[PDB]
Structure formats: structure tokens, C-alpha cells
Amino acid sequence: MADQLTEEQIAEFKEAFSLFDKDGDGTITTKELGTVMRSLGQNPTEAELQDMINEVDADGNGTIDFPEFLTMMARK
Ligand SMILES: [Ce+3]
Ligand SMILES: [Ce+3]
């Protein structure tokens, strides 16, 4: 019906995570990360990304989730 800050807000962020998540599986790997970058005009190696993914992923699953990525947004 409408939107709203707080939790509701996140609902929106969902889409954000999608941008990066080109798998729609619910996770953001490296490639998927080195993809959207094309929009910004970037394209780091699988090494850098890994570090970037290991900058939010405190679980060390190797990939990035929605809640693990949400933090990335909070940053900047
Ligand atoms: Ce994915
Ligand atoms: Ce993770």
C-alpha cells in the first residue's frame, strides 16, 4: 500500500540487494559484486571483492546476504 521508515524501510533495501545480487537467490557473491560495479565503471579482481565481501560477511560463508549487505549501505 505504502512505505515507511524503520523495518518497512528495509523492505525497500531488499531491491537494493538485488541490484548486486544478479542471482536473485538471496546472496551476493564476488562476481555478482564485480558486476554491478560496471554501473559505477569499476571492475575489481576476485581478490579485492573477496576482501570486500569479507568486510561485511562476519560469518565467513564466502558470500553476502541481505542482512550482511545492509550493513554496507549503512556505512556510506
Ligand atoms: Ce547470488
Ligand atoms: Ce554471509
Side-chain angles (χ1 to χ4, degrees), residues 10-26:
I10 224 94
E12 302 175 83
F13 277 76
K14 287 208 261 156
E15 301 209 283
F17 185 61
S18 228
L19 249 97
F20 283 86
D21 160 47
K22 246 262 135 238
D23 258 354
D25 54 1

Side-chain angles (χ1 to χ4, degrees), residues 29-73:
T29 181
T30 42
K31 208 167 138 285
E32 299 174 33
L33 214 93
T35 258
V36 150
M37 293 247 135
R38 75 213 143 152
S39 294
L40 247 75
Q42 290 148 224
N43 203 32
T45 79
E46 233 195 296
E48 190 122 270
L49 297 146
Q50 211 82 46
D51 236 274
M52 303 164 134
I53 293 200
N54 287 346
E55 286 237 299
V56 265
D57 174 23
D59 106 61
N61 60 6
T63 207
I64 300 248
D65 303 323
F66 169 54
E68 316 258 84
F69 148 103
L70 283 147
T71 160
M72 239 237 83
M73 303 240 99

